[PDB]
């Protein structure tokens, strides 16, 4: 009626995404139809709608439209050719420190906006960092995203992809701040520097073991008041690998950024704003312009 | 071998079906009536018959390298000859090595027998235990 | 590029147990006009 | 072509809200329920609640349609 | 045992993938140009036909499905011992000096 | 955040006249739709009668969200009532019955806010037979997409409760003249309920609604809090902003003053005429 399907982009466990073109602006969009008991419109779709309707940033996906028919709906976002995962996994295209800095800058600017609006993207991973041909990174899906400000609210500890989960979520923190997004951002940066998933865990216990053996188990002066979380279990005291050994070709400023994003104390962990103010982003290799970022061709 | 044949006709049946559909669509004229959709029906129904046909020949196991020859359009029959030359030549390796190191066993033990007189019987036991009894 | 069939076996889950959803009525797109075809030889 | 950080000026139509760090030493956190030690183990600090309440209190006051 | 693909599974995927591909094409055909819709069908039919030709050769070869992997492993086993002895021998040269040093 | 919200951008209108324009436009649209399809039948409702029925069914919406068997948070109730207000701002009561839309607004508010309630529970909160509960759930699910479409997919509602709490915090902090601002809490809860009964949610920011509740409670309790406006909010210098805020607060206080609750006989007659309009479609 107003949008014409162009390509069969794919599916997620609650959506079917088709490339499309509107007959009003000949702009290429991505339409997302939601599938279908006795509950009504799926809550992930409503969460997408409600959160993305009140955000407008360069680096957050925006639903250009939303509509639907009997018992089912379709959202309409900017069409994003790739995500950061296909850029990471493609061995053909290199990620110079400037390219890494560009991806990090776009991610943290979007997340700084999202956190100034007291919304928490509780699922941040290279799969969910889309980017268009203009090389503008956008935070992809908000189907598990919440408002973290008010306290009377009991959150859930199980919501973020395991590999990009903060230690406190694995320990079962029912209440958390921006530290979950920032830990996932640190893990994204680590995967962006290594091109392979930092801390790939087979379970929550395995994810915690790998976090602790890679960074050192927190000693309660680094993460004071840790032992109070609902699912805390004591761990063998791992030494942890020095960061200049995990990332052997990262500058000292980048190492400080890594250390800040990977602090165990979810309150000493740097926020998007103070991450953006660190010397890494202001140092000599400027981020690449979105026009010069590499695109995975086919 | 009856099942082997039974699957084969269905496979070649599909190939003929594709050609007929390809020719019909290529040579499309108004003088064709209900002759196109029927061919597609024979195709879709033809595909389903193959699924039932692959299960009676389930016992057949295709080696990985053989399908590699098929994938690249190589000569799987030549590989059978290659294996034939492979086994025949390397059967001489195991036997040739064995015979090479068996004569060293027989002659050396005979040499030990000609140097030590007081330990003569023991050397005869070495050869006995050097066999696979 | 023709080694797909080898690659197709490492990911059986791409095709569910029996068959993918099928709707014969939706196959009306196979209703074809009578037009020519360039850059294609028989 | 280096990068300089700009503080993301988003114009709230209301009185100024003090910063989150400069919020316990102005006295606000005395009148907010203290975060439990378990809550503090995560990223929650009882100044997030105070800061959100103050930002929604002053979000639109100097604004009509 | 592992070095080998089941014949039944090999046939299973191609039938469905060709079916799955066709279903993917069925969506794109209605919304394409009159001259372009035929290109997809002809290319898909020719490409799909070629994929089926591989199985035809595979089945006609099935008579040798039993005695090819047997010799492949046997030949490697003979090669393994034939070369393991050489790799074995190279080790002693070090041991004839390293072990003497250790002793 | 409200200052960036879609509630500020679209659902915050300049005057009650624009609200009456929207509602009269919706009523006229339904009337013309009924006439042009098979011309002045007295079965129709007037815009003011529609407003009376809307006030009545918003009262019933508060009653339902107050007796909800799981303790419904007050943000959820505020969101549901805001949805009711908007939906019937742009839609006619005779097209969609306000009881089904009442329940649908409650349902969507329970889902948009993260008050996780299963559908069997939600319909168990209805004083109807299990058959009636099943049918009510069917209607709610039928009307949920319609409700979301009629909201223009603007599902985030900003309620005056969090600005109320933030003003209370700032008032205990930087306003030592006031001691124990929780007497203000009780009286401002009363005034905030009163002001939620009216159409002020579509006309003023939640911050202004909360500040008006607080300063109204002070004025009723004899406290003067002009030093909290001029000082401690730095309206001492932008005098025009201070007078603008005072005009907003006076306007909204008067708006609560002139609110006339729906009657008992009038609501009975309107319910009967509405059910006759719905039965004969």
Write the layout of secondary structure elements.
The structure is cut from a larger assembly and holds chains A (about 300 residues), B (about 130 residues), C (about 40 residues), D (about 60 residues), E (about 100 residues) and F (about 280 residues).
Chain A (H helix, E strand, L loop, with lengths): L2 E10 L2 E8 L5 E7 L8 H10 L10 E7 L2 E7 L3 E2 H6 L7 H20 L2 E3 L7 E3 L5 E3 L5 E3 L19 H4 L8 H16 L9 H12 L27 H4 L5 H10 L10 H5 L2 H4 L16
Antiparallel strand pairs in A: 1-2, 2-3, 3-5, 4-5, 6-8, 7-10, 8-9
Helix pairs in contact in A: 3-5, 5-8
Chain D lengths: L36 H5 L5 H11 L8
Chain F lengths: L5 H4 L6 H21 L10 H21 L6 H17 L7 H15 L6 H6 L5 H21 L10 H14 L8 H15 L8 H15 L5 H5 L8 H19 L7 H15 L2
Structure description:
- Chain A is an alpha+beta fold and 298 residues long.
- Chain A folds into 2 domains: 4-81, Phosphorylase Kinase, domain 1 (2-Layer Sandwich), CATH 3.30.200; 82-297, Transferase(Phosphotransferase) domain 1 (Transferase(Phosphotransferase), domain 1).
- Helix content of chain A is 31%, strand content 18%.
- Chain A has helices at 43-52, 84-89, 97-116, 167-170, 179-194, 204-215, 243-246, 252-261, 272-276, 279-282, and strands at 3-12, 15-22, 28-34, 63-69, 72-78, 82-83, 119-121, 129-131, 137-139, 145-147.
- In chain A, the strands form 3 sheets. Chain A has a 5-stranded antiparallel sheet, covered by helices on one side. Chain A has a 3-stranded antiparallel sheet with strand order 6-8-9. Chain A has a two-stranded antiparallel ribbon with strand order 7-10.
- Chain E is mainly alpha-helical and 103 residues long.
- The chains are: A alpha+beta (298), B mainly alpha (133), C little secondary structure (42), D mainly alpha (65), E mainly alpha (103), F mainly alpha (281).
- Chains in contact: A-D, A-E, A-F, B-C, B-E, C-E, D-F.
- The interface between B and E is large, with 43 and 45 residues.
- Chain A: Its main location: nucleus.
- Chain A: This is Cyclin-dependent kinase 7.
- Chain A: Residues 3-281 form the Protein kinase domain.
- Chain A: Keywords: Acetylation, ATP-binding, Cell cycle, Cell division, Cytoplasm, DNA damage, DNA repair, Kinase, Nucleotide-binding, Nucleus, Phosphoprotein, Serine/threonine-protein kinase, Transcription, Transcription regulation, Transferase.
Highlighted features:
part of a larger assembly, 6 chains, F: 281 residues, mainly alpha, Cyclin A, domain 1, 2 domains, 0% strand, Mediator of RNA polymerase II transcription subunit 14 (chain E), cyclin-dependent protein serine/threonine kinase activity (chain A), phosphoprotein (chain A), transcription (chain A)
Summarize the structure.
This is part of a larger assembly, with chains A (298 residues), B (133 residues), C (42 residues), D (65 residues), E (103 residues) and F (281 residues). Helix content of chain B is 76%, strand content 2%.
What is the first-to-last residue Cα distance of chain D?
41 Å
Protein chain pair with the most extensive contact, residues per chain: B-E, 43 and 45 residues
Compute the gyration radius of chain A: what is it? Answer: 20 Å
CATH fold node name of the largest domain in chain A: Transferase(Phosphotransferase), domain 1
How many strands, what sense, and barrel or not for the largest sheet of chain D? none
CATH class value of the largest domain in chain A: Mainly Alpha
Q: Beta-sheet strand percentage of chain A? A: 15-25%
Terminal Cα separation of chain A, in Å?
A: 31 Å
- Estimate percent helicity of chain D: 10-25%
- Shape, per Cα inertia axes of chain D: extended
Gyration radius of chain D, in Å: 15 Å
The appropriate CATH architecture of the largest domain in chain A is Orthogonal Bundle
Instruction: Output the CATH homologous superfamily of the largest domain in chain A.
Output: Transferase(Phosphotransferase) domain 1
In total, the number of domains of chain A comes to 2
Structural class of chain A: alpha+beta
Strand order of the largest sheet of chain A: 1-2-3-5-4
Helical percent range of chain A?
25-40%
Instruction: Count the beta strands of chain A.
Output: 10
Order of helices and strands of chain A: EEEHEEEHHEEEEHHHHHHH
Keywords (chain B): Activator, Nucleus, Transcription, Transcription regulation
Family (chain B): Belongs to the Mediator complex subunit 10 family.
Subcellular location (chain B): Nucleus
Pfam family, one (chain B): Med10
């Amino acid at each position: 009626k107003r949008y014409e399907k162009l390509d069969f982009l794919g599916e997620g466990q609650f959506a079917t995404v088709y490339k499309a073109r509107d007959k009003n602006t000949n702009q290429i969009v991505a339409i997302k139809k939601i599938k279908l008991a006795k509950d009504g419109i799926n809550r992930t779709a409503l969460r997408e709608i409600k959160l993305l309707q009140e955000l407008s940033h360069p680096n957050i996906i925006g639903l250009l439209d939303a509509f639907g028919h009997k018992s089912n709906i379709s959202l309409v976002f900017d069409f994003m050719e790739t995500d950061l995962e296909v850029i990471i996994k493609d061995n053909s295209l290199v990620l110079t420190p400037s390219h890494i800095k560009a991806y990090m800058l776009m991610t943290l600017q979007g997340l700084e906006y999202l956190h100034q609006h007291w919304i928490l993207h509780r699922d941040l991973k290279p799969n969910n960092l889309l980017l268009d041909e203009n090389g503008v990174l956008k935070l992809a899906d908000f189907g598990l995203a919440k408002s973290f400000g008010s306290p009377n609210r009991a959150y859930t500890h199980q919501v973020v992809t395991r590999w990009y989960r903060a230690p406190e979520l694995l320990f079962g923190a029912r209440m958390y701040g921006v530290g979950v997004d920032m830990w996932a951002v640190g893990c994204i940066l680590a995967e962006l520097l290594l091109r392979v998933p930092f801390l790939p865990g087979d379970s929550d216990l395995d994810q915690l073991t790998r976090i602790f053996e890679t960074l050192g188990t927190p000693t309660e002066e680094q993460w004071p008041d840790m032992c109070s979380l609902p699912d805390y279990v004591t761990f063998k005291s791992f030494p942890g690998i020095p960061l200049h050994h995990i990332f052997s070709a990262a500058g000292d400023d980048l190492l400080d950024l890594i250390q800040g994003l990977f602090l165990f104390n979810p309150c000493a962990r740097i926020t998007a704003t103070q991450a953006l103010k660190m010397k890494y982003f202001s140092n000599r290799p400027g981020p690449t312009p979105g026009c010069q970022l590499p695109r995975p061709n086919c | 071998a009856e099942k082997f044949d039974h699957l084969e006709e269905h496979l070649e049946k599909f190939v003929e079906n594709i050609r007929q559909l390809g020719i019909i669509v290529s040579d499309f004229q108004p003088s064709s009536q209900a002759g196109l959709n029927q061919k597609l029906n024979f195709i879709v129904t033809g595909l389903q018959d193959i699924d039932k046909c692959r299960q009676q020949l389930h016992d057949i196991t295709v080696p990985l390298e053989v399908f590699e020859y098929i994938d690249q359009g190589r000569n799987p029959q030549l590989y059978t000859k290659e294996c034939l030359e492979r086994a025949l030549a390397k059967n001489e390796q195991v036997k040739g090595k064995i015979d090479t190191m068996k004569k060293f066993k027989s002659l050396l033990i005979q040499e030990l027998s000609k140097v030590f007189p007081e330990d003569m019987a023991k050397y005869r036991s070495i050869r006995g235990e050097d066999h696979p009894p | 590029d023709n080694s797909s069939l080898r690659s197709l076996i490492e990911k059986p889950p791409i095709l569910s147990s029996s068959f993918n959803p099928i709707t014969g009525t939706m196959l009306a797109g196979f209703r074809l006009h009578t037009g020519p075809l360039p850059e294609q030889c028989r | 072509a280096l990068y300089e950080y700009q503080p993301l000026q988003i114009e709230t139509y209301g009185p100024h809200v003090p910063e989150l760090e400069m919020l316990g030493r102005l006295g606000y956190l005395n009148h907010v329920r203290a975060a439990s030690p378990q809550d503090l183990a995560g990223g929650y600090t009882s100044s997030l609640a105070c800061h959100r309440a103050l930002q929604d209190a002053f979000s639109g006051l100097f604004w009509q349609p | 045992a592992s070095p080998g693909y089941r014949l039944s599974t090999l046939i299973e995927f191609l039938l469905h993938r060709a079916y799955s591909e066709l279903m993917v094409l069925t969506d794109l055909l209605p919304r394409k140009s009159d001259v372009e819709r035929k290109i997809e069908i002809v290319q898909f039919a020719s490409r799909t036909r070629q994929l089926f030709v591989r199985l035809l050769a595979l089945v006609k070869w099935a008579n040798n499905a039993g005695k090819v992997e047997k010799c492949a492993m046997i030949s490697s086993f003979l090669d393994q011992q034939a070369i393991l002895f050489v790799d074995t021998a190279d080790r002693l040269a070090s041991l004839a000096r390293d072990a003497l040093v250790h002793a | 955040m409200y200052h960036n919200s879609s509630q500020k951008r679209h659902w915050t209108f300049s005057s009650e006249e624009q609200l009456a324009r929207l509602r009269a436009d919706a009523n006229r649209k339904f009337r013309c739709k009924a006439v042009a399809n098979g011309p002045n039948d007295p079965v129709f409702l007037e815009p003011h009668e529609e407003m009376t029925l809307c006030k009545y069914y918003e009262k019933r919406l508060l009653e339902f969200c107050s007796v909800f068997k799981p303790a419904m948070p007050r943000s959820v109730v505020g969101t549901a009532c805001m949805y009711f207000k908007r939906f019937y701002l742009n839609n006619s009561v005779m097209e969609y019955h306000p009881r089904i839309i009442m329940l649908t607004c409650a349902f969507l508010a329970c889902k948009v806010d993260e008050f996780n309630v299963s559908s069997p529970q939600f319909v168990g909160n209805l004083r109807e037979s299990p058959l009636g509960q099943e049918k009510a759930l069917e209607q709610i699910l039928e009307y949920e997409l319609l409700l979301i479409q009629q909201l223009n997919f603007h599902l985030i509602v900003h309620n005056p409760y969090r600005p109320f709490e933030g003003f209370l915090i700032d008032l205990k902090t930087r306003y030592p003249i006031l001691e124990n601002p929780e007497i203000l809490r009780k009286t401002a809860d009363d005034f905030l309920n009163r002001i939620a009964l009216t159409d002020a949610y579509l006309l003023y920011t939640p911050s202004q609604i909360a500040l008006t509740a607080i300063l109204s409670s002070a004025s009723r309790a004899g406290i003067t809090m002009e030093s909290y406006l001029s000082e401690s909010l730095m309206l001492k210098e932008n005098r025009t902003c201070l007078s603008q805020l005072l005009d907003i607060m006076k306007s909204m206080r008067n708006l609560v003053k002139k609110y006339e609750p729906p009657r008992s006989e009038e609501v009975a007659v309107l319910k009967q005429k509405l059910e006759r309009c719905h039965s004969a479609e």
